[PDB]
From Swiss-Prot, chain A:
Present with 17000 molecules/cell in log phase SD medium. It comes from the Eukaryota. 4'-phosphopantetheine is transferred from CoA to a specific serine of the Acyl carrier domain by the C-terminal PPT domain. This modification is essential for activity because fatty acids are bound in thioester linkage to the sulfhydryl of the prosthetic group. Belongs to the thiolase-like superfamily. Fungal fatty acid synthetase subunit alpha family. Fatty acid synthetase catalyzes the formation of long-chain fatty acids from acetyl-CoA, malonyl-CoA and NADPH. The alpha subunit contains domains for: acyl carrier protein, 3-oxoacyl-[acyl-carrier-protein] reductase, and 3-oxoacyl-[acyl-carrier-protein] synthase. This subunit coordinates the binding of the six beta subunits to the enzyme complex. The chain holds residues 292 to 388 of 1887 of the full protein. This is Fatty acid synthase subunit alpha. Signal peptide: none annotated. It comes from Saccharomyces cerevisiae (strain ATCC 204508 / S288c). [Alpha(6)beta(6)] hexamers of two multifunctional subunits (alpha and beta). The gene is FAS2.
UniProtKB/Swiss-Prot annotation, chains B, C:
Present with 17000 molecules/cell in log phase SD medium. It comes from Saccharomyces cerevisiae (strain ATCC 204508 / S288c). [Alpha(6)beta(6)] hexamers of two multifunctional subunits (alpha and beta). This is Fatty acid synthase subunit alpha. Signal peptide: none annotated. Belongs to the thiolase-like superfamily. Fungal fatty acid synthetase subunit alpha family. Fatty acid synthetase catalyzes the formation of long-chain fatty acids from acetyl-CoA, malonyl-CoA and NADPH. The alpha subunit contains domains for: acyl carrier protein, 3-oxoacyl-[acyl-carrier-protein] reductase, and 3-oxoacyl-[acyl-carrier-protein] synthase. This subunit coordinates the binding of the six beta subunits to the enzyme complex.
Length: 72, 49, 49
């Protein structure tokens, strides 16, 4: 270990996928047939999360102006 | 509709997860509007504007 | 029709491959008839028969 230190020596699941792709595509055509938006939920939600952001900004401002002591 | 439902179940895919998340946010809006409607009642619209 | 289309896609199965191959052959017929219609124009129907 002194010698070595001087000289510088040392001492499967692409089938389960392809099925779930088929199922997903079949679901999509049944959804289309039933005139059924699957995202309508997440849309409505993203739109509300914006109005929350907006109302929190109004309320965070009044706290900045009046102070937490006065608002409480 | 029934065929869609079994494909959704198979894909482990909640179709209401969207409307849930949304109803839960519409509550936090209601809550923050109540806080803000109160400060307007206390300070007045003139002072807040 | 839409359900058929997704099963066809899954099976890697071109439904037009047939009509393609056919349109391509109908062209080679057109071409060989043009060669043969020319030799009839040159030599005459009497000579060719």
């Amino acid at each position: 270990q002194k010698y070595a230190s001087i000289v510088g020596v040392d001492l499967l699941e692409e089938i389960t996928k392809d099925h779930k792709v088929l199922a997903r595509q079949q679901l999509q055509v049944l959804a289309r047939y039933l005139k059924m938006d699957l995202d309508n939920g997440e849309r409505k939600f993203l739109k509300e999360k914006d109005t929350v952001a907006e109302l929190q900004a109004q309320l965070d401002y009044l706290n900045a102006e009046l102070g937490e002591f006065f608002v409480n």
